[model samples]
Target: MAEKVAVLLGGTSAEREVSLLSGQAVLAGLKEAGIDAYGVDTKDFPVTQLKEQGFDKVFIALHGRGGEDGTLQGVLEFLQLPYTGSGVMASALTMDKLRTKLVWQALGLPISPYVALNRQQFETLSPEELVACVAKLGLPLIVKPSHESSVGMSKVDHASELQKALVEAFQHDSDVLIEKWLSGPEFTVAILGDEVLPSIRIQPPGVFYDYDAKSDKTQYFCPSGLSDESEQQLAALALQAYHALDCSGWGRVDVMQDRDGHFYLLEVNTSPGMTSHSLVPMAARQYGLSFSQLVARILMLAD
Candidate 1:
């Protein structure tokens, strides 16, 4: 009998709905290829259950928080079960934006200048001080949590409402980050078996992309709206971010471009979305790899 592959999805993250879709898609893909695969919800996923269910290898289709923040990966490690995505250390590093930035910054990569905001700083600071600090980096600064995804509670520009944006960002995570915004295009790249697959863009509507915009399909422009030079740069930078975290298996990297053509590191996602409306699968299709081939190649890397 073929080994049963458990594709864990429907994570506890705010992006759980999307995870459900991604998980189902992967399950179908694996089945199509004659791989015995089962869809499991990360909401209450247990390796002990996998053993009971007779699954051998696991395909991590979960994104964000409990599913991808090294929780599931760490658990699987302890259980000695072979699973997809990065190992614990790499997954942990990539999940937290500030941590990943520090790692990349240490490597001398071109990350945007950022200032972290503690709760004390958020509550006690004067508006002038806040504006002054962010102004030092220039207008259109981005505000985001240290670790979160689905663009969950991230904002950009609107300096006048700095405190408001900071508050919203803090709601998702305690540590907040504000950095100089990249006015140019945004793009992402995926990895499969040592090759940087198609470079994509997470385009949301309006001035700056946010949470509501994330699920709004009309908002995104995958493969992004860009030139050859810009796409190449994003793809190169994304690969650097992925490899820097010492990640194995496959993952996606989001990158922002400035008006002058410089790309800013927008954090790497060890567990990016894979729903029908997702970005990575679109890139995978570009490489002529069907969903089954994509999942199989991901399985190949874990081994």
Candidate 2:
């Protein structure tokens, strides 16, 4: 009999819609690869039920919050059911962008500068004080909810727009971050096991790769047109960043190169999207792995 695998998706998170699509796609891929995979939306199924369902391993397709924030991983750990992607500590650490930066910063890794503020602290500050605090990061800062995905992000080009940007970002997460906008080309690295797949340079027809650009099909350069040296350097840095977070199995790392061609680390996506437009699948193709093969490899690596 084929090994039974459960693909967990559609959790109670902002990324639930994308997770549903990712789950279905992973289910098809695993089925095509001859694995007896079952789709179980976390919203409908509980972690403790995996044993009752006769699932030997789990493929996590959940993103954001309850799914990707180590809570699900903890439950799986308690249940003793092996699952794909990063484990509890890594998931929880990486989910908080502020803490992730702290880890990287301690290691002397290159990361963009930013100001971190929680809702309680932010509310205590007057409007002028808040603006003054963010002013240190400079103009054209990117406001984001530290714990949320592509949602609740805004670019404030001037101090006048700072309050509005924070208002929008605060809606998504209790902790918000304002990063100095790196005006340069962006790239993403997909790490599978010990190998880092080819880097992809994203060229969005907008100020940044927002939800629309990620959801819609934006132009992505696989070769990234980087010099061999630069590509290798970026890949090495990405691999180090991935390991820095103690992330294993598989994950995606976002990166940006400033005008001086120096790379800075962006956030890490432990459970990156596997939708049609997702970067991991695209990078896997460049690495000579089909979606089915990629999905199977990830499953095979499950601990």
Candidate 3:
């Protein structure tokens, strides 16, 4: 008999809709794999009811704050309920883009230089001081909320746009990150257990892979078409970034490489989306692993 699994999704976060899409995919996949799985939205359904509902294992499909930020993972841990994705500390650390970079940079990982600013600092900075800060990071900066997804992000093609970009980011989060924009192709690696699946090179038509690009069917190359040696280097660096955060189970690590083939660490997604346009499922399919098998693999590896 299959163990009953509860697929948690649709939390009270900016990514709730995405989580719902992911949760439905996971629920269907798990059931197809002969697991007694059911969808449970954390927004409407109290997570404390999991044990009372007799779920044997948990498959987290939620993204963003309440779910991806470690609070929900902590609750599951407290209840002694085995769940998929990273544990508490890893989830919390990786959820905040600024802290994730700090940990990676400390480990000597190649991360893009960034300037992080909080809401208070943002409000106090004079126009001239703000321009100086942007000057320090160089032009073509990637401004985004440190604690949000691609919800409120902008590309500052010129220094004149820095303030506007920062203001847009601050709308979504108190802390914002102004990262050095890498002028190269972006790649996302999906890690399942100890296996690092094939990397996907994202080619968005826009300036960057923003929310619209991510959801509006952007072109992606699964094999990435990098030389075998380059692929190995990327995989190694991605694995390092993943482990540096103590991330386990299943997750995704985003990377960007200069034309010289130097990889720069982006951020890690502890609970990556499972939507039709998602990268994890796409990467898994490259390895002949169906969505059902992928979800089952994640469920079996639940801790």
Candidate 4:
């Protein structure tokens, strides 16, 4: 009998809508690849029942907290059901930007300088003190929730905006990360099995790649128009970052260049988006794999 695959989707997270889209796309691709796949929204489906329900494998398509964090992965582990993407520890570690950066820093990986602020500290700090805390990072720094993506992220170009940005970020997570802004282009690399597909340069139509920019239209250039040397450099860094987090199955690494053209690790997306226009699929296509082929290959790597 063919393995019955459950593509876990929509959950009670900020990225539920996107997860739904990604899950549907993954389900379609799996079916197209001749796999017996079904879409299961974690919002409506009890993941604890996946085993009793006869699911042979799981393809996690959800994002953000509850889904992308180790919670769902832990449940699946307890169920003894093989699943795609990173394991519980890796998923939990990478889900928090601060912890991910710490792991990269410990390994001496290139990453932008940042400060981690907790909700209590943020609430007690005065406006001046708050600004003083991040003075070393200089102006035009990025403020974002340590455990979120796209949402609750802000680029503060002025001191006056610092408090507001921190407040927005705190709304999403108790821990917030404030980092030095990279005044260069952004790139994302997708990993499949042992292969690093290709780099895609992101050009947002706004001040930065925030929640609005990600959900809305944004220009992306695959091949990233980088020289072979730069391309290889990015590929190597991405692979190192991925392995440092012990990420398995497949994942995506985001990187940004500083003003001097030095690349820095942004964060790792363990179970990144699989929408038709998501970065991973874009890089996969450039590497000569159709969406169906990509999804199937990920499933084959499960366990």
Candidate 5:
């Protein structure tokens, strides 16, 4: 029987707009690949009734909370419906950058240095005291909402910028993570099943890959121009990080190289974007998979 698939998108998240774009692309791709697929705006459509609506499977094209987090996965689990991407635990863990970094750190995985701060701590600490705490990490840090992505992220290049960055980040979430800035090139690796597609190097047109840079026209190098040895090293590290979080199906691991040419784990996207221009699809093309084929393959891995 042809599986009736639902491409979940446009949830009540900061990334809802991007999710809609991704979900629409996914819907078109699945249909082009000859799959019976439909686009379901999670913001308007109650996911609890997907089964009642006769959806055989779900392709999670949503990003950020509610959709990418474990909440939707949990609902699908209770309904006993197979879905693409990680299960509840992995989705939940990876969505929270603080916890994700903690897991990576405990496993001895390489991750950029970061200081986690909560609302109370931010409220109680004076500007000087807060600066003192992050002094160890040095200047040129990034302050972001621990549970959000792309949105509510800012770069603190100067000491005076820390408070303003924290203020913006805290507006999105109570917990914020301030990370030491990496001065090297940024890369992202896409994982499909057991295969790690080629790495894509992100060259932003700005100081950093912030919300504007990501949404704007950012140059991406598919081959990443890495040597064989470096490519192997990055691929190995990405797979290790993905498995460390117990992520299954498919995901994208964001990485950055330090000044010493050492790679550091940034964060993992469980339900990464599926748009034609998204990083995962860009890498998949380098691996000889078209956007449609990639979506179909992901659906095949649904469990």
Candidate 6:
């Protein structure tokens, strides 16, 4: 008898629509592969419901705050159901940009330099102090909310725009990170248990990769062109970053490429969205795996 896979989808997060798309794709794929699959919307996910479903494993397709921040994973863990993707601790740790970077930065990982700020600081800090921080990290510093996805709330650059952008970012989270925006190429890598797909250079269409570019279908470039050596280096760094966050099941890491072709760690996505437009899916397709095959592999590795 085949085990039933309960695929979790759609939540109250900012990325709910996308999660629905990813869930639909995963369900179609599973059925195509002759696997029994069903989706349970996390719109009301609870431990009791999960246990009652008699699901053997889970296919995590949710993204953003509630889905990726260990909320769902914690429930699954308590229910004793082996789920796909990351565990409770890893999901929570990496979901937080500030906390995740603190651990990586301390370990001497090659991450871009950054400083944390709060909402109060956003309103009260003087331009002189704020500019000094950006200057210290160098111009084109990225301002991001500590725990949001799809670059949730981010500011790219332009000296005149710094203050307003920082203030906007504060609307998303109490903790905001002002980080070095490395020049040259931007990249991302998906890591599954230590297996890293190729490095993908992100063409933000401008100075920064913001929310607009994320949903625009024509804007992305995956397998972002790299030499074997360059690819190996990026993959290695991503895996290192993954393990740094204590991630064991699966996830994705963002990286920056300097002019010299050196890769710098950006941030980690612990839950790594299972949606169609997400980075993980881009990598999975490159490996020639259909959505169902990918879900099956993720489920097979559950635990």
What TM-score would each prediction reach against the true structure? 0.88, 0.91, 0.91, 0.92, 0.91, 0.87
Model 2 over residues 257-283: C-alpha lDDT tens digits?
886889999878889899998899999
Clashing pairs in 6: none
Residue 154 lDDT (model 5): 84
Off by over 4 Å in 1: 149-160, 215-230
lDDT of 2 at 195: 85
lDDT of 1 by residue, 75-190 (tens): 88877789988889998888778888888999988888888777788778887788777777777777888876444355555778787777778788777889887775777788
Predict model 3's lDDT versus the native.
0.88
Model 4 misplaced regions, further than 4 Å:
123-125
lDDT of 1: 0.78
- Encode model 4's per-residue lDDT on 19-107: one tens digit a residue: 99999999999999999999999999899999999999999999888777789999999999999999999998987788889999999
Worst 10 residues of 1 by lDDT: 148-157
Candidate No. with top TM-score: 4
lDDT of each: 0.78, 0.89, 0.88, 0.90, 0.90, 0.75
How many residue pairs clash in all the candidates, one count each?
A: 1, 0, 0, 0, 0, 0
Instruction: Give the lowest summed-lDDT range of ten residues in model 3.
Output: 208-217
